[PDB]
């Protein structure tokens, strides 16, 4: 039909950037005057709402995405034709671009932001405004998208199905080990190196000498 859709990716990119934009805006407006005393009841309504909401909302969002993808798993995966595999890979490269950006937000943006809010309070708790967004929002979110990209490849692509790419395995799981080292040389998930190389190998296979050498030198 067509190998390259993208429609879904843009749904993801837009649906996300928008959301954080809202959140960053909101925290501009209720960070300042509303999240400075944690013992105040204006904190229970504007910040402790978010924490108590998003956790069970993330948890379900997670298992849902997992469960669903395994359900709609392709039960005769080895049969996939070259054009459908190609299409399935370009979906996976999609999932990784939305993963990419979920990472940006939750690891750079809301992470170093907590750095500036440290210099703004002396601290009431470890449920500060930035902690809520950084630790209990942005991190779990990019952690869900991750599990997604992982389950999706596991249930659509022969290679990733029957196996467990270690690179990928790491990328999906590493996220549950950011809590230690520390409360905020090192063990990290650039495992995406392995995963794009594994994607790239399939793409090199899925063109005969025809595409390979000829079309591209």
């Amino acid at each position: 039909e067509s190998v390259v859709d993208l429609r879904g990716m843009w749904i993801g990119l837009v649906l996300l950037n928008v959301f954080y934009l809202i959140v960053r805006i909101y925290e501009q407006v209720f960070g300042w005057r509303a999240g400075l005393d944690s013992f105040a009841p204006e904190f229970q309504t504007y910040w402790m709402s978010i924490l108590w909401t998003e956790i069970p909302l993330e948890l379900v969002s997670g298992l849902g995405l997992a469960g669903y993808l395994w359900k709609t798993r392709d039960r005769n995966v080895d049969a996939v034709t070259p054009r459908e595999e190609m299409r399935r890979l370009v979906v996976l490269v999609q999932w990784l671009v939305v993963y990419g950006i979920a990472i940006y937000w939750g690891a750079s943006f809301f992470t170093e932001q907590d750095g500036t809010w440290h210099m703004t309070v002396i601290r009431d708790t470890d449920f500060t405004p930035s902690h809520i967004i950084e630790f209990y929002m942005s991190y779990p979110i990019y952690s869900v998208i991750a599990v997604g990209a992982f389950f999706y490849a596991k249930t659509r692509i022969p290679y990733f199905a029957h196996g467990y790419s270690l690179a990928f395995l790491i990328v999906a799981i590493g996220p549950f080990m950011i809590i230690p080292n520390v409360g905020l040389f090192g063990w990290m998930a650039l495992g995406v190196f392995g995963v794009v190389l594994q994607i790239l190998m399939r793409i090199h296979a899925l063109v005969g000498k025809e595409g390979v050498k000829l079309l591209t030198e």
Partner: protein, 235 residues
């Protein structure tokens, strides 16, 4: 503002705070209120908290809603760390120039080396004006003035953003000149060598020569402007 949550017995048996006073509980942007007071260094200093041999005086406030112009404790101008002797009392004061319009709850604060923050009393301090109007300023030894709120930020961007753009050039260059997939596949097959080999390396050696030259220049210039400079003053 979190004093509430700190351990009760510790707030009681470290710093004992008295006669704390705020010049004015309202200021204009650029208008120069002052917070002062006295503190007695409890005599049976808890184990939990470093000895106050190294401490630092502070305005407990949500960011630079007030610039601090100066501060003093134990009869010294104290922009650096100072020793507090167990059992004695010290007097302090902080000169606070309004900056951001609102109603902030401003505290006297001292932090101990291996201790953490100890928060004194705090009073609401209505500021009014437009932040756009806030200035410093400050005088160099050479005699000139500079508005701190803005000084130097120009020059910074001037050097950072060009280089970031340079960095992004370098990347977009190689990218669209030999693809990811193309170059992957080339490498994956025999070669490689198609992907690089001079005069790709001529580009490199040149780009690098310019980079270093861009540095020696930028150095020498910024060395001519500001040919004085001293190291950060600490201790």
């Amino acid at each position: 503002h979190g004093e509430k949550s700190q351990q009760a017995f510790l707030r009681m048996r470290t710093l004992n705070w008295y006669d704390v006073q705020w010049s004015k509980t309202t200021v204009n942007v650029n208008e120069e209120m002052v917070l002062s007071g006295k503190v007695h260094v409890f005599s049976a200093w808890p184990q939990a908290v470093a000895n106050p041999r190294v401490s630092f005086l502070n305005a407990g406030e949500p960011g630079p809603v007030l610039v601090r112009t100066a501060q003093f404790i134990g009869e010294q101008f104290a922009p650096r760390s100072v020793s507090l002797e167990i059992g004695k009392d010290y007097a302090f004061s902080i000169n606070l120039r309004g900056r951001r319009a609102g109603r902030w709850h401003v505290h006297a604060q001292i932090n101990v080396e291996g201790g953490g923050p100890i928060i004194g009393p705090g009073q609401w301090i209505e500021i009014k004006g437009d932040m756009k109007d806030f200035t410093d300023p400050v005088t160099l030894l050479d005699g000139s003035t500079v508005d701190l709120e803005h000084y130097g930020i120009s020059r910074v961007y001037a050097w950072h953003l060009p280089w970031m753009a340079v960095g992004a050039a370098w990347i977009f260059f190689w990218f669209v000149r030999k693809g990811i997939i193309t170059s992957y596949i080339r490498v994956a097959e025999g070669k490689a060598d198609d992907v690089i080999g001079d005069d790709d390396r001529r580009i490199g050696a040149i780009v690098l020569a310019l980079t270093i030259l861009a540095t020696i220049v930028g150095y020498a210039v910024t060395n001519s402007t500001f040919p004085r400079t001293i190291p950060l003053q600490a201790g």
